[PDB]
Amino acid sequence: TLPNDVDLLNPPAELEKRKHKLKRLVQSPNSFFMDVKCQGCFNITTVFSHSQTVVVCGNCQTVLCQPTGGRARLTEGCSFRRKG
Amino acid sequence: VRVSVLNDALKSMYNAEKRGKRQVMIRPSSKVIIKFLIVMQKHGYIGEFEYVDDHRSGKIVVELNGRLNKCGVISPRFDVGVKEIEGWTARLLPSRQFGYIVLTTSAGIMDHEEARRKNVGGKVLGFFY
Amino acid sequence: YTSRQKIHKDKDAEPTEFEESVAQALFDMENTNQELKSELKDLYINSAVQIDVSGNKKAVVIHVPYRLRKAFRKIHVRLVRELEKKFSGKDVIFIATRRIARPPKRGSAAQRPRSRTLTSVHDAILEDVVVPAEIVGKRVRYRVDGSKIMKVFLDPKERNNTEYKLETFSAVYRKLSGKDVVFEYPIT
Amino acid sequence: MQNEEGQNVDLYIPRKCSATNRVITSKDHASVQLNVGHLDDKGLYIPGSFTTFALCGFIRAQGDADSALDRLWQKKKVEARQQ
Amino acid sequence: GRMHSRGKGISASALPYKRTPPSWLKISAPDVEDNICKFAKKGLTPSQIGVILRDSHGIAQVKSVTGSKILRILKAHGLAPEIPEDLYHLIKKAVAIRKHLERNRKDKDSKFRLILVESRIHRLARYYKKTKKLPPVWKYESTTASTLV
Amino acid sequence: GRTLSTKEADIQMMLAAEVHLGTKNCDFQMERYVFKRRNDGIYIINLGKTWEKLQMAARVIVAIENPKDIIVQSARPYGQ
Ligand SMILES: [K+]
Ligand SMILES: [K+]
Ligand SMILES: [Mg+2]
Ligand SMILES: [Mg+2]
Ligand SMILES: [Mg+2]
């Protein structure tokens, strides 16, 4: 976009989302917390979207997520809801 | 590393004004930068500027009138007495009819004409015209 | 006990008629209303002031002890809505009492906590005034004429509770710190 | 520029770019001046009435003349009730 | 850029503008301090404690709920380590490199990296001596560095 | 019925003529006129901006007192 075609103080939300997290007008992370539930257990656990550790449900002792390079990969059975 | 935030701000404004941009971004912000911008705005060399809070040093967006020929920092900040202002203006300003040298005196940050009026010396911060 | 226990002015000063009226209102709120009876037994206000915001409208600002700020916050909405009906359309604002210390003189070895600085206290007051809204952004615009106008962004979640209080917030903040502030809700 | 008495002293007052505010010099042969005609309620051109825009060679050589002129015309048409 | 390389990476955390805890979080500050102290007693560094809290207990930032940093809480309870964690890890890396070099005299790259790591150790130790986080007599010696850890 | 306005019919004619079909590449100074890129890769031109620019060009042309001072030329065979 040409510089005079945009406002530096009122950038469109799409551009702000597309920008690097630190290069936005105000820094904001791309991570979030989620409520993950096992397939069979009613217990509900909070997990970081980019967890570096293998989160295990206390009740059934089952691994909910696996650390990766970026976002943690959840187990096939489990499902998540964005918490925020 | 970053040594003079004022230099970065003034250089960004100078480059943007040369390019013809209507707005420029200054990062990080500083109260010395804000005082310099207020001195510039007092004389019509810039438009409205807005400070953005990010729980950090901050950011400023400056409107550019197109009247700014060149704004610059002077480093190191030399001591300027009330009697050296004439020589400094001769060295730095294009003419005796317009242009300002910004000083930091014990009475505050001000242009050289006000420093002459109040008979206060200090240290040279920069210039603009 | 009497309603005087609900007002604790500094240096044991004698409150004016408005402080007494607000203390009485709090006393009847504690007594008649059973739901808030438990909460208001150990809550008292340092002082209460009246500030005009617009024609035919006014606002009342109540200062409360700093140590009871959390207790006041956890019951803020019910208390404000109950007190508003008694003042005939006057908004009620709760601001925790804080002390501002002047900067130490040049060359002095005295140290002042940063919380006691003027800027920190002003920021805390601004945070408290917009309760229950949460500030999500701050912009300061420097006008060509030399005036400053601050724009404060509030969370849209508390829109229904804060939209009608924007002018009162602006007037109260201007009275408390002499700063021009406008309030806007981010669009999304 | 004026004398102490108040007499005009400059040979002439050069034009300025409508977009960049730069001074348009005598040898700037890349600079252009454009007139945008005004229309009445029936979409007919009113002779002698138009909005004048001047562009310096610097902006036109940059390729930014088109967008700048579009923005300037939009603002001026909004102000002048030309729609 | 990097201190001891030509890397110019900018990857880092982006702290949210909101400094208050999320509404869904219900734990109390004394509870968080108790868990932090328990983890420290179990032998976890402040970085590890913060990672565990964020990944499991939903505590994005301990300062948001407690109002203070993890190391401050540990010090307030007399649980901070004698030497700071980062200096400890640097010394551990130096010890590992020296142990490897003991059996590999021809590994000149390891010698280069040991020089760099020990320069980092000395600069950090000087800073910690300036701030009184180490006793003035403290000195890093390669011969008996393994004892310190 | 519902007779179309002048702009409506003009844009319909432009669509019939495929005036809105760009190339696979976009100039950074022509981006403000492009609406969006289709899955194939051809950029779709915003016909409303095209009509507004046509009106603006007509406004500029009409103000020339002598039409003989205007020169219009096409290098390609199609536009001759
Ligand atoms: K380096
Ligand atoms: K990294
Ligand atoms: Mg400095
Ligand atoms: Mg170096
Ligand atoms: Mg870098």
JSON list of N, CA, C and O and ligand atoms in Angstrom, two decimals, chain E residues 1 8-10, ligand 5:
[
{"chain": "E", "resi": 1, "resn": "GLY", "atom": "N", "xyz": [22.52, -6.99, 17.68]},
{"chain": "E", "resi": 1, "resn": "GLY", "atom": "CA", "xyz": [22.71, -8.40, 17.22]},
{"chain": "E", "resi": 1, "resn": "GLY", "atom": "C", "xyz": [23.26, -9.29, 18.31]},
{"chain": "E", "resi": 1, "resn": "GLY", "atom": "O", "xyz": [23.42, -8.87, 19.45]},
{"chain": "E", "resi": 8, "resn": "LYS", "atom": "N", "xyz": [21.25, -12.10, 13.61]},
{"chain": "E", "resi": 8, "resn": "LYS", "atom": "CA", "xyz": [20.44, -10.89, 13.76]},
{"chain": "E", "resi": 8, "resn": "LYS", "atom": "C", "xyz": [18.98, -11.24, 14.00]},
{"chain": "E", "resi": 8, "resn": "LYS", "atom": "O", "xyz": [18.09, -10.46, 13.66]},
{"chain": "E", "resi": 9, "resn": "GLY", "atom": "N", "xyz": [18.72, -12.41, 14.57]},
{"chain": "E", "resi": 9, "resn": "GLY", "atom": "CA", "xyz": [17.34, -12.82, 14.80]},
{"chain": "E", "resi": 9, "resn": "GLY", "atom": "C", "xyz": [16.64, -11.92, 15.79]},
{"chain": "E", "resi": 9, "resn": "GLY", "atom": "O", "xyz": [17.24, -11.38, 16.72]},
{"chain": "E", "resi": 10, "resn": "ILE", "atom": "N", "xyz": [15.33, -11.76, 15.58]},
{"chain": "E", "resi": 10, "resn": "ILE", "atom": "CA", "xyz": [14.51, -10.89, 16.41]},
{"chain": "E", "resi": 10, "resn": "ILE", "atom": "C", "xyz": [13.40, -11.67, 17.12]},
{"chain": "E", "resi": 10, "resn": "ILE", "atom": "O", "xyz": [12.46, -11.08, 17.63]},
{"chain": "G", "resi": 5, "resn": "MG", "atom": "MG", "xyz": [18.08, -6.48, 15.37]}
]
